[PDB]
Amino acid sequence: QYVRIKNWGSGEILHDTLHHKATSCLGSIMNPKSLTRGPRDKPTPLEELLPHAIEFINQYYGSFKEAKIEEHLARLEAVTKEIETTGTYQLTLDELIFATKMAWRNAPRCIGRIQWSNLQVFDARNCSTAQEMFQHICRHILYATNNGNIRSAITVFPQRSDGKHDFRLWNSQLIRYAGYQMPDGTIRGDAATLEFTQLCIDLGWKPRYGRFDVLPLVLQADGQDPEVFEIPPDLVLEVTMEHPKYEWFQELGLKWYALPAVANMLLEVGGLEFPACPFNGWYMGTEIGVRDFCDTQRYNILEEVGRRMGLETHTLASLWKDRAVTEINVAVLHSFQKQNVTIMDHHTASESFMKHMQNEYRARGGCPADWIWLVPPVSGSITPVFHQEMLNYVLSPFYYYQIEPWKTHIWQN
Amino acid sequence: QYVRIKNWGSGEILHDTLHHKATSCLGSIMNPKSLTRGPRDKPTPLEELLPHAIEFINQYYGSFKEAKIEEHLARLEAVTKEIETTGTYQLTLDELIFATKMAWRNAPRCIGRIQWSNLQVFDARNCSTAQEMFQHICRHILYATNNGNIRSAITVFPQRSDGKHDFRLWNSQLIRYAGYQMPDGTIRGDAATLEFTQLCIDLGWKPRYGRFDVLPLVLQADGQDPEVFEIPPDLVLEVTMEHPKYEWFQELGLKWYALPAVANMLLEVGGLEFPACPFNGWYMGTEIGVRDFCDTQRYNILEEVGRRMGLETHTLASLWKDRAVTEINVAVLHSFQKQNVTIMDHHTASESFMKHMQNEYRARGGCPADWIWLVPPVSGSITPVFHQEMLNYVLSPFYYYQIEPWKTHIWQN
Ligand code: HEM
Ligand code: HEM
Ligand SMILES: C[C@H](O)[C@H](O)C1CNc2nc(N)[nH]c(=O)c2N1
Ligand SMILES: C[C@H](O)[C@H](O)C1CNc2nc(N)[nH]c(=O)c2N1
Ligand SMILES: O=[N+]([O-])c1ccc2[nH]ncc2c1
Ligand SMILES: O=[N+]([O-])c1ccc2[nH]ncc2c1
């Protein structure tokens, strides 16, 4: 009938009934095929599209206090008719809005989901060129940033039609720092963007060889070739790292962008696929303080902050790492707060997520959750999420990963 | 053919071929049925036992630089013969030793597995009464403790025969503190052992109503009723909590036992089942410092250590929790080191585990690993394990969970 879910912290039990609406032991795999919706060079077969489309129209019209049956039946008919005559179909703006929030709502890996209903939708389905994409993206960045008072938003570009005319942002995130393979063996900047940085150069981009060089938007429109565009510096808002007690922190010359905007995911809804639909929320402290600054495959500033703290950076047992990373986290939080830039610490985030789950189970009996992703990279068992058993499952609408565009792209020049 | 496993930190790739030898989306479930080997009231059907038995005899004799074929064939024959005439079969001491290390080696949830080959085996298969079990357990505790220089060991009691004559320790761990439902609503001691503490009282145990009262061994022998036994205090070694800078720490009057000995798991090997086989290794700092002392469902001393540190325990964003728990961890490590009691910090543990995995893949191409359990309850991404993708799968031999004995036990009085 259902599935019991226990919360070892409060002892509370829950019954998951929502997992029955899923699709189809790979433990900690980052990019599992089950979470990816790749390319296709032929339209969505009508026998597949029509059913998925109806289900979505039923979901949409099925959600409202005062349900209007007429409009529902009518939409069902007009949609089927549209599919018959055109092949694919066009969602109403209202439906799209609903789609994007639901897809987010159904994001197993997102901790910010309590905010799900609070999203801004930019309808760029009329878009047709790279330069027009670049303008919509700029519009996005400017609206989302709001001078530090960050706002969650998403820009939806034209849906995949036949598959050969795909709209795709080649970037992983909208704002992202560059990383270069320095002469003296060392890596400079964000070592994670090394491979993509090279690509930008190959497409003719002037590399400013620095630690915090904002990378260029690499836009692909209507299947065409990717065109490079430098993001207007005035648009990219950054925070300078500063510790509230360690005056030597600023001397580290650190900073990070305030806009966490996922750029390369595909939105699937009612059988339709939107290969380009960048979105953003606001940062959660640990993202910058722990992953960005502390991963060895990133800025790796941990040993650096260690010695300047006086810690025994040569004795693991001294727990100097637990000491440094915490102070780094404090810097991030302090710096965003001082410069009036939205941000939420992980504890607070975890609590709101728990409240979210409770709301989700009451409202629909379930909440697709990925424990491996929801538990913060620090203070694991200190956050309530660690103690909550949770079910992971792909629903619909949903945000899928895509095959890195530079692999499956037939060049023209 | 195989399965690619990537380590996002070093970028290294690995090929898992060992997962093919497994048995048979439930994400973060603590006690999944797949990890439990419950009761049975009939012997292991010969058609099932014979094949499993052979596989094990092939595994055993298949592991050695200089393989002796004769002994192998002979053992195969004698084993089958024994199964024909008696039903079940008896493992040689050498085989049992090999079984216990392999079962440990195959423990997805254990981080200490680099130590796998370094285990002491106490053969108590001749045991027949509760009082004899109690003596073997005492012998175990005394050998494992070694006056602080902890030694990994396991005591194997008689295998399950028909299922109605099960040897079972009713305790979760050998040494474990009691927890009572105090008059004034509050809970005293280890809130996790509340239900079991009540049981001990019901079986006639004198409750000393304290924060650190070592619970009694509740032993069940040859299917008989569970008899209670108080662990000789001289045997139970404890460490007094003491911070190296905060002289007010000792004032908290904290302490914890030095012996982490899992008592209620079942050992499965070559079709045979050993329902009682307590084992132990040595503590990993975070276990006591984070889970035992900091979980809200345990001693919950976090807010307590917070205020005495001066921290803003009323503002989550101040990261006071990240500050306290770290100092608590420091206390634990410092206290065990000072009192000459073995212990390993989590960073060091993680590193050794990584070395283990590398050894496992080279030696047998795989290492069953549970990421959710291997990643420390603090400093997640700071440890290398967080970045390692890993496959979870039940092999054989293996240590299974059992249904809590007090549920499926037909009382006699
Ligand atoms: C308003 C604040 C929000 C917060 C605090 C939040 C936080 C997070 C965090 C911390 C992660 C993990 C990121 C990583 O480790 O790479 C994440 C992932 C994700 N979030 Fe949210 N989020 C927010 C808004 C949004 C919105 C508006 C959407 C979509 C419309 C969304 C969709 C997702 C998706 C799909 C992922 C997965 C990305 C991946 O798998 O790499 N988030 N979020
Ligand atoms: C020598 C030092 C050892 C260390 C540092 C170590 C550490 C750990 C840790 C930290 C856990 C997680 C405990 C929890 O959160 O409940 C664990 C679990 C486990 N360990 Fe080890 N271990 C050691 C030796 C052993 C030995 C000797 C065996 C078996 C012969 C073993 C078998 C297991 C099993 C089966 C579990 C799972 C228990 C459960 O699922 O609740 N460990 N170990
Ligand atoms: C709900 C969640 O699975 C549970 O609280 C966990 C997770 N990981 C764990 N990790 C370890 N080592 N030990 C545990 O008790 C748990 N419990
Ligand atoms: C190997 C492991 O799955 C990987 O490093 C993880 C795990 N959990 C994560 N959690 C979040 N939120 N983000 C991540 O990048 C990862 N990566
Ligand atoms: O996906 N997102 O928009 C998103 C939102 C908030 C975030 N904090 N840290 C990473 C991150 C990503
Ligand atoms: O299972 N064990 O023997 C075992 C060994 C070491 C440990 N550290 N923390 C818990 C724990 C359990």
GROMACS .gro file of C-alpha atoms in nm, chain B:
model
  413
  414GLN     CA    1   3.174  -0.644  -1.833
  415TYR     CA    2   3.247  -0.414  -1.538
  416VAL     CA    3   3.129  -0.086  -1.379
  417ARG     CA    4   3.327   0.241  -1.389
  418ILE     CA    5   3.368   0.408  -1.050
  419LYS     CA    6   3.506   0.763  -1.038
  420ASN     CA    7   3.678   0.946  -0.752
  421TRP     CA    8   3.590   1.313  -0.809
  422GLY     CA    9   3.877   1.420  -0.585
  423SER     CA   10   4.177   1.253  -0.749
  424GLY     CA   11   3.994   1.202  -1.077
  425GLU     CA   12   4.093   0.835  -1.068
  426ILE     CA   13   3.880   0.564  -1.230
  427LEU     CA   14   3.821   0.204  -1.116
  428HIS     CA   15   3.651  -0.103  -1.267
  429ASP     CA   16   3.422  -0.304  -1.041
  430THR     CA   17   3.398  -0.671  -1.139
  431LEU     CA   18   3.324  -0.807  -0.789
  432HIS     CA   19   2.958  -0.698  -0.788
  433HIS     CA   20   2.871  -0.997  -1.008
  434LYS     CA   21   2.915  -1.225  -0.706
  435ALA     CA   22   2.631  -1.055  -0.516
  436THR     CA   23   2.291  -1.194  -0.416
  437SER     CA   24   1.974  -0.983  -0.468
  438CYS     CA   25   1.443   0.297  -0.455
  439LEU     CA   26   1.518   0.215  -0.089
  440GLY     CA   27   1.768   0.496  -0.028
  441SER     CA   28   1.861   0.584   0.329
  442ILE     CA   29   1.674   0.301   0.504
  443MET     CA   30   1.857   0.193   0.818
  444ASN     CA   31   1.732  -0.167   0.850
  445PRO     CA   32   1.638  -0.278   0.496
  446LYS     CA   33   1.510  -0.637   0.466
  447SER     CA   34   1.792  -0.704   0.217
  448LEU     CA   35   2.039  -0.661   0.507
  449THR     CA   36   1.849  -0.886   0.750
  450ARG     CA   37   1.858  -1.263   0.798
  451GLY     CA   38   1.563  -1.347   1.021
  452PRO     CA   39   1.441  -1.653   1.215
  453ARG     CA   40   1.347  -1.998   1.078
  454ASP     CA   41   1.187  -2.301   1.253
  455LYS     CA   42   1.313  -2.567   1.010
  456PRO     CA   43   1.668  -2.666   0.907
  457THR     CA   44   1.829  -2.525   0.593
  458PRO     CA   45   1.688  -2.735   0.302
  459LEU     CA   46   1.964  -2.962   0.172
  460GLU     CA   47   1.924  -2.841  -0.185
  461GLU     CA   48   2.011  -2.488  -0.069
  462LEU     CA   49   2.282  -2.576   0.184
  463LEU     CA   50   2.489  -2.812  -0.035
  464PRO     CA   51   2.552  -2.557  -0.316
  465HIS     CA   52   2.634  -2.268  -0.079
  466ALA     CA   53   2.863  -2.500   0.115
  467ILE     CA   54   3.060  -2.599  -0.196
  468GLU     CA   55   3.098  -2.238  -0.310
  469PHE     CA   56   3.245  -2.152   0.028
  470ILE     CA   57   3.482  -2.449   0.023
  471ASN     CA   58   3.596  -2.336  -0.322
  472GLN     CA   59   3.642  -1.979  -0.201
  473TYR     CA   60   3.846  -2.095   0.098
  474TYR     CA   61   4.073  -2.336  -0.087
  475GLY     CA   62   4.087  -2.091  -0.376
  476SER     CA   63   4.268  -1.836  -0.161
  477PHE     CA   64   4.638  -1.908  -0.111
  478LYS     CA   65   4.967  -1.852  -0.295
  479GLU     CA   66   5.044  -2.225  -0.296
  480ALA     CA   67   4.711  -2.401  -0.357
  481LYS     CA   68   4.682  -2.761  -0.237
  482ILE     CA   69   4.439  -2.938  -0.472
  483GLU     CA   70   4.421  -3.272  -0.289
  484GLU     CA   71   4.305  -3.123   0.039
  485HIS     CA   72   4.053  -2.916  -0.158
  486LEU     CA   73   3.892  -3.214  -0.337
  487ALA     CA   74   3.903  -3.411  -0.012
  488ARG     CA   75   3.733  -3.134   0.186
  489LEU     CA   76   3.468  -3.101  -0.084
  490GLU     CA   77   3.392  -3.476  -0.054
  491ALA     CA   78   3.399  -3.494   0.325
  492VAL     CA   79   3.173  -3.189   0.347
  493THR     CA   80   2.913  -3.328   0.106
  494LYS     CA   81   2.928  -3.659   0.293
  495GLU     CA   82   2.881  -3.482   0.625
  496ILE     CA   83   2.580  -3.296   0.487
  497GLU     CA   84   2.434  -3.625   0.361
  498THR     CA   85   2.465  -3.800   0.698
  499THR     CA   86   2.402  -3.514   0.943
  500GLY     CA   87   2.212  -3.254   0.743
  501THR     CA   88   2.428  -2.953   0.830
  502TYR     CA   89   2.810  -2.938   0.850
  503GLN     CA   90   3.092  -2.820   1.073
  504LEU     CA   91   3.354  -2.573   0.958
  505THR     CA   92   3.719  -2.628   1.040
  506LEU     CA   93   3.864  -2.368   1.281
  507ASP     CA   94   4.077  -2.244   0.992
  508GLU     CA   95   3.767  -2.201   0.776
  509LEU     CA   96   3.581  -2.016   1.051
  510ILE     CA   97   3.872  -1.773   1.095
  511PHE     CA   98   3.870  -1.718   0.720
  512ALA     CA   99   3.491  -1.679   0.729
  513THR     CA  100   3.492  -1.411   0.997
  514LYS     CA  101   3.756  -1.198   0.830
  515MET     CA  102   3.586  -1.228   0.490
  516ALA     CA  103   3.246  -1.141   0.638
  517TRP     CA  104   3.407  -0.834   0.794
  518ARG     CA  105   3.594  -0.763   0.471
  519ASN     CA  106   3.252  -0.770   0.303
  520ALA     CA  107   3.095  -0.524   0.548
  521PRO     CA  108   2.962  -0.233   0.337
  522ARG     CA  109   2.912  -0.015   0.644
  523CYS     CA  110   3.254  -0.059   0.810
  524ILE     CA  111   3.529   0.204   0.767
  525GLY     CA  112   3.785   0.007   0.965
  526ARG     CA  113   3.813  -0.267   0.703
  527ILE     CA  114   4.182  -0.208   0.629
  528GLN     CA  115   4.229  -0.407   0.951
  529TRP     CA  116   4.026  -0.701   0.818
  530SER     CA  117   4.303  -0.962   0.825
  531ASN     CA  118   4.400  -0.862   1.182
  532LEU     CA  119   4.127  -1.036   1.383
  533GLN     CA  120   4.125  -1.275   1.678
  534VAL     CA  121   3.875  -1.560   1.675
  535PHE     CA  122   3.728  -1.720   1.987
  536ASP     CA  123   3.571  -2.054   1.901
  537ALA     CA  124   3.280  -2.103   2.140
  538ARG     CA  125   3.094  -2.351   1.920
  539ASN     CA  126   3.116  -2.607   2.207
  540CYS     CA  127   2.919  -2.371   2.432
  541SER     CA  128   2.587  -2.496   2.565
  542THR     CA  129   2.459  -2.278   2.852
  543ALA     CA  130   2.396  -1.912   2.933
  544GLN     CA  131   2.652  -1.918   3.214
  545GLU     CA  132   2.906  -2.057   2.965
  546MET     CA  133   2.816  -1.783   2.720
  547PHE     CA  134   2.863  -1.523   2.993
  548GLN     CA  135   3.212  -1.659   3.061
  549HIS     CA  136   3.313  -1.648   2.695
  550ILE     CA  137   3.183  -1.294   2.671
  551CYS     CA  138   3.384  -1.194   2.977
  552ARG     CA  139   3.688  -1.361   2.823
  553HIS     CA  140   3.619  -1.157   2.511
  554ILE     CA  141   3.580  -0.825   2.688
  555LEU     CA  142   3.901  -0.886   2.882
  556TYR     CA  143   4.102  -0.981   2.572
  557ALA     CA  144   3.962  -0.700   2.355
  558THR     CA  145   4.016  -0.430   2.618
  559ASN     CA  146   4.380  -0.518   2.685
  560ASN     CA  147   4.405  -0.228   2.933
  561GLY     CA  148   4.339   0.037   2.669
  562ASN     CA  149   4.548  -0.118   2.389
  563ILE     CA  150   4.229  -0.240   2.218
  564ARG     CA  151   4.235  -0.554   2.005
  565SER     CA  152   3.980  -0.654   1.741
  566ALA     CA  153   3.817  -0.987   1.827
  567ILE     CA  154   3.510  -1.203   1.768
  568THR     CA  155   3.351  -1.486   1.965
  569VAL     CA  156   3.155  -1.739   1.759
  570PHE     CA  157   2.885  -1.937   1.939
  571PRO     CA  158   2.705  -2.250   1.803
  572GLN     CA  159   2.549  -2.222   1.456
  573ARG     CA  160   2.173  -2.229   1.406
  574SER     CA  161   2.062  -2.588   1.369
  575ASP     CA  162   1.686  -2.619   1.333
  576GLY     CA  163   1.611  -2.260   1.428
  577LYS     CA  164   1.430  -2.336   1.754
  578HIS     CA  165   1.764  -2.372   1.938
  579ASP     CA  166   1.910  -2.026   1.864
  580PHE     CA  167   2.206  -1.884   2.059
  581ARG     CA  168   2.140  -1.508   2.089
  582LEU     CA  169   2.273  -1.205   2.282
  583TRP     CA  170   1.978  -0.973   2.341
  584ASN     CA  171   2.203  -0.668   2.373
  585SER     CA  172   2.280  -0.435   2.081
  586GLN     CA  173   2.646  -0.391   2.190
  587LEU     CA  174   2.841  -0.570   2.466
  588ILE     CA  175   2.906  -0.258   2.678
  589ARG     CA  176   2.620  -0.010   2.659
  590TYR     CA  177   2.485   0.252   2.899
  591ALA     CA  178   2.136   0.241   3.047
  592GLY     CA  179   1.860   0.494   2.995
  593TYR     CA  180   1.566   0.555   3.227
  594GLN     CA  181   1.238   0.742   3.194
  595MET     CA  182   1.287   0.983   3.487
  596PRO     CA  183   0.988   1.103   3.704
  597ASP     CA  184   1.007   1.470   3.598
  598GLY     CA  185   0.951   1.386   3.229
  599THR     CA  186   1.321   1.408   3.137
  600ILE     CA  187   1.527   1.112   3.016
  601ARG     CA  188   1.846   1.015   3.197
  602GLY     CA  189   2.150   0.852   3.042
  603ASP     CA  190   2.139   0.693   2.696
  604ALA     CA  191   1.786   0.761   2.565
  605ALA     CA  192   1.849   0.510   2.289
  606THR     CA  193   1.854   0.213   2.528
  607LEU     CA  194   1.524   0.312   2.698
  608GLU     CA  195   1.318   0.020   2.567
  609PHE     CA  196   1.588  -0.242   2.631
  610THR     CA  197   1.665  -0.102   2.980
  611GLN     CA  198   1.303  -0.162   3.072
  612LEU     CA  199   1.344  -0.521   2.957
  613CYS     CA  200   1.645  -0.577   3.181
  614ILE     CA  201   1.440  -0.447   3.477
  615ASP     CA  202   1.151  -0.678   3.382
  616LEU     CA  203   1.392  -0.972   3.393
  617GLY     CA  204   1.493  -0.861   3.740
  618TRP     CA  205   1.784  -0.617   3.720
  619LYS     CA  206   1.863  -0.356   3.985
  620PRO     CA  207   1.846  -0.011   3.813
  621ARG     CA  208   2.109   0.227   3.956
  622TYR     CA  209   1.942   0.534   3.798
  623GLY     CA  210   2.251   0.712   3.666
  624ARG     CA  211   2.386   0.868   3.347
  625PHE     CA  212   2.644   0.599   3.284
  626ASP     CA  213   2.514   0.268   3.422
  627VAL     CA  214   2.659  -0.020   3.221
  628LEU     CA  215   2.369  -0.245   3.117
  629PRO     CA  216   2.362  -0.624   3.184
  630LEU     CA  217   2.428  -0.901   2.931
  631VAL     CA  218   2.095  -1.063   2.838
  632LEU     CA  219   2.194  -1.405   2.713
  633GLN     CA  220   1.984  -1.667   2.535
  634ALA     CA  221   2.131  -2.015   2.490
  635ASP     CA  222   2.023  -2.317   2.282
  636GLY     CA  223   1.679  -2.164   2.231
  637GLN     CA  224   1.626  -2.136   2.609
  638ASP     CA  225   1.502  -1.827   2.794
  639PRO     CA  226   1.729  -1.521   2.829
  640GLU     CA  227   1.923  -1.501   3.155
  641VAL     CA  228   2.055  -1.170   3.285
  642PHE     CA  229   2.421  -1.121   3.390
  643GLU     CA  230   2.588  -0.806   3.524
  644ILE     CA  231   2.922  -0.735   3.359
  645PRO     CA  232   3.206  -0.744   3.614
  646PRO     CA  233   3.288  -0.370   3.663
  647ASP     CA  234   3.663  -0.441   3.657
  648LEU     CA  235   3.616  -0.557   3.297
  649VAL     CA  236   3.443  -0.243   3.167
  650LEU     CA  237   3.709   0.022   3.094
  651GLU     CA  238   3.590   0.383   3.062
  652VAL     CA  239   3.744   0.717   2.961
  653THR     CA  240   3.666   1.037   3.152
  654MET     CA  241   3.597   1.332   2.924
  655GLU     CA  242   3.849   1.613   2.954
  656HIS     CA  243   3.918   1.913   2.723
  657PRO     CA  244   4.282   2.022   2.678
  658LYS     CA  245   4.204   2.396   2.714
  659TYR     CA  246   3.855   2.418   2.864
  660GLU     CA  247   3.898   2.332   3.232
  661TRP     CA  248   3.520   2.349   3.263
  662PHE     CA  249   3.481   2.043   3.039
  663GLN     CA  250   3.547   1.785   3.310
  664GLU     CA  251   3.275   1.963   3.513
  665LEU     CA  252   3.031   1.817   3.261
  666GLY     CA  253   3.105   1.483   3.426
  667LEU     CA  254   3.116   1.295   3.098
  668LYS     CA  255   3.276   0.965   3.006
  669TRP     CA  256   3.232   0.673   2.763
  670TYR     CA  257   3.336   0.307   2.740
  671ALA     CA  258   3.640   0.214   2.535
  672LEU     CA  259   3.491  -0.102   2.387
  673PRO     CA  260   3.273  -0.079   2.077
  674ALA     CA  261   3.152  -0.436   2.042
  675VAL     CA  262   2.860  -0.519   1.811
  676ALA     CA  263   2.666  -0.797   1.973
  677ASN     CA  264   2.350  -0.881   1.783
  678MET     CA  265   2.454  -0.963   1.430
  679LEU     CA  266   2.432  -1.293   1.246
  680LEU     CA  267   2.725  -1.443   1.058
  681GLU     CA  268   2.634  -1.621   0.735
  682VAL     CA  269   2.889  -1.847   0.573
  683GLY     CA  270   2.862  -2.137   0.330
  684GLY     CA  271   2.490  -2.168   0.393
  685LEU     CA  272   2.551  -2.186   0.767
  686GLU     CA  273   2.416  -1.925   1.007
  687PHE     CA  274   2.570  -1.811   1.339
  688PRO     CA  275   2.304  -1.600   1.524
  689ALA     CA  276   2.550  -1.505   1.802
  690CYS     CA  277   2.898  -1.382   1.718
  691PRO     CA  278   2.980  -1.054   1.895
  692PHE     CA  279   3.279  -0.864   1.760
  693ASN     CA  280   3.470  -0.546   1.824
  694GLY     CA  281   3.732  -0.315   1.685
  695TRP     CA  282   3.828   0.023   1.834
  696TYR     CA  283   3.638   0.351   1.842
  697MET     CA  284   3.658   0.624   1.579
  698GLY     CA  285   3.637   0.959   1.757
  699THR     CA  286   3.323   1.095   1.590
  700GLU     CA  287   3.122   0.799   1.712
  701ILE     CA  288   3.135   0.920   2.070
  702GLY     CA  289   3.196   1.288   2.009
  703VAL     CA  290   2.925   1.332   1.748
  704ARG     CA  291   2.666   1.056   1.753
  705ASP     CA  292   2.668   0.948   2.120
  706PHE     CA  293   2.717   1.293   2.274
  707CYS     CA  294   2.550   1.509   2.011
  708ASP     CA  295   2.246   1.330   1.861
  709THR     CA  296   1.924   1.474   2.007
  710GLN     CA  297   1.808   1.115   2.064
  711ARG     CA  298   2.115   1.043   2.279
  712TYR     CA  299   2.306   1.242   2.541
  713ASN     CA  300   2.234   1.564   2.346
  714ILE     CA  301   2.508   1.777   2.511
  715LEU     CA  302   2.543   2.025   2.224
  716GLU     CA  303   2.348   2.325   2.358
  717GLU     CA  304   2.509   2.252   2.697
  718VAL     CA  305   2.866   2.279   2.560
  719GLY     CA  306   2.751   2.573   2.354
  720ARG     CA  307   2.667   2.821   2.628
  721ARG     CA  308   2.969   2.726   2.833
  722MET     CA  309   3.174   2.830   2.528
  723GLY     CA  310   3.012   3.175   2.515
  724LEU     CA  311   2.862   3.114   2.170
  725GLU     CA  312   2.537   3.267   2.042
  726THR     CA  313   2.338   2.947   2.096
  727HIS     CA  314   2.023   3.132   1.988
  728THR     CA  315   2.136   3.224   1.637
  729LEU     CA  316   2.178   2.925   1.401
  730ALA     CA  317   2.368   3.134   1.147
  731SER     CA  318   2.652   3.189   1.401
  732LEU     CA  319   2.753   2.827   1.337
  733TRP     CA  320   2.789   2.769   1.711
  734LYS     CA  321   2.696   2.407   1.656
  735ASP     CA  322   2.989   2.365   1.416
  736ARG     CA  323   3.206   2.517   1.686
  737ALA     CA  324   3.087   2.310   1.983
  738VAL     CA  325   3.075   1.968   1.824
  739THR     CA  326   3.432   2.019   1.705
  740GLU     CA  327   3.556   2.098   2.055
  741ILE     CA  328   3.357   1.799   2.190
  742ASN     CA  329   3.537   1.583   1.929
  743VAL     CA  330   3.868   1.728   2.048
  744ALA     CA  331   3.782   1.633   2.407
  745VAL     CA  332   3.709   1.271   2.315
  746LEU     CA  333   4.030   1.232   2.115
  747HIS     CA  334   4.235   1.408   2.380
  748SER     CA  335   4.087   1.200   2.662
  749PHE     CA  336   4.143   0.865   2.491
  750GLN     CA  337   4.501   0.959   2.400
  751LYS     CA  338   4.586   1.077   2.751
  752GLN     CA  339   4.443   0.766   2.919
  753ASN     CA  340   4.631   0.539   2.675
  754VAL     CA  341   4.315   0.399   2.512
  755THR     CA  342   4.319   0.322   2.137
  756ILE     CA  343   4.115   0.548   1.912
  757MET     CA  344   4.136   0.691   1.560
  758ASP     CA  345   4.013   1.028   1.439
  759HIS     CA  346   3.780   1.026   1.138
  760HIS     CA  347   4.019   1.192   0.890
  761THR     CA  348   4.282   0.931   0.949
  762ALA     CA  349   4.013   0.661   0.931
  763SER     CA  350   3.895   0.788   0.596
  764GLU     CA  351   4.245   0.792   0.456
  765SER     CA  352   4.311   0.432   0.561
  766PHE     CA  353   3.980   0.329   0.410
  767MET     CA  354   4.082   0.480   0.077
  768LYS     CA  355   4.407   0.283   0.091
  769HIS     CA  356   4.193  -0.020   0.170
  770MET     CA  357   3.970   0.024  -0.138
  771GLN     CA  358   4.279   0.051  -0.360
  772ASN     CA  359   4.407  -0.275  -0.212
  773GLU     CA  360   4.067  -0.440  -0.256
  774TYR     CA  361   4.027  -0.345  -0.623
  775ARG     CA  362   4.378  -0.463  -0.708
  776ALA     CA  363   4.331  -0.790  -0.516
  777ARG     CA  364   3.974  -0.871  -0.619
  778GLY     CA  365   3.830  -0.588  -0.826
  779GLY     CA  366   3.572  -0.443  -0.594
  780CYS     CA  367   3.487  -0.342  -0.241
  781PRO     CA  368   3.125  -0.341  -0.125
  782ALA     CA  369   3.080   0.009   0.018
  783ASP     CA  370   2.789   0.202   0.168
  784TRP     CA  371   2.858   0.573   0.116
  785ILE     CA  372   2.580   0.679   0.357
  786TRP     CA  373   2.757   0.492   0.633
  787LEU     CA  374   3.121   0.549   0.539
  788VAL     CA  375   3.101   0.926   0.532
  789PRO     CA  376   3.163   1.069   0.882
  790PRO     CA  377   2.880   1.253   1.066
  791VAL     CA  378   3.098   1.568   1.046
  792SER     CA  379   3.351   1.705   0.794
  793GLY     CA  380   3.185   1.530   0.499
  794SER     CA  381   3.361   1.669   0.193
  795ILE     CA  382   3.675   1.730   0.397
  796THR     CA  383   3.735   1.351   0.401
  797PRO     CA  384   3.837   1.176   0.075
  798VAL     CA  385   3.555   0.917   0.108
  799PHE     CA  386   3.291   1.178   0.024
  800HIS     CA  387   3.434   1.215  -0.326
  801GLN     CA  388   3.460   0.847  -0.399
  802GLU     CA  389   3.173   0.690  -0.591
  803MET     CA  390   3.103   0.345  -0.451
  804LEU     CA  391   2.895   0.032  -0.515
  805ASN     CA  392   2.689  -0.126  -0.239
  806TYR     CA  393   2.620  -0.503  -0.252
  807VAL     CA  394   2.577  -0.803  -0.021
  808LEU     CA  395   2.836  -1.076  -0.077
  809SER     CA  396   2.916  -1.387   0.125
  810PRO     CA  397   3.032  -1.455   0.390
  811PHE     CA  398   2.848  -1.161   0.544
  812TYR     CA  399   2.720  -1.009   0.873
  813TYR     CA  400   2.345  -0.966   0.868
  814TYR     CA  401   2.110  -0.787   1.103
  815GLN     CA  402   1.853  -0.995   1.287
  816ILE     CA  403   1.495  -0.932   1.396
  817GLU     CA  404   1.504  -0.794   1.749
  818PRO     CA  405   1.494  -1.121   1.954
  819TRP     CA  406   1.224  -1.006   2.198
  820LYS     CA  407   0.973  -0.992   1.914
  821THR     CA  408   1.009  -1.345   1.776
  822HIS     CA  409   1.069  -1.544   2.095
  823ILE     CA  410   0.830  -1.804   2.236
  824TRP     CA  411   0.856  -1.763   2.615
  825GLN     CA  412   0.861  -2.060   2.854
  826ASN     CA  413   0.809  -1.861   3.177
   0.00000   0.00000   0.00000
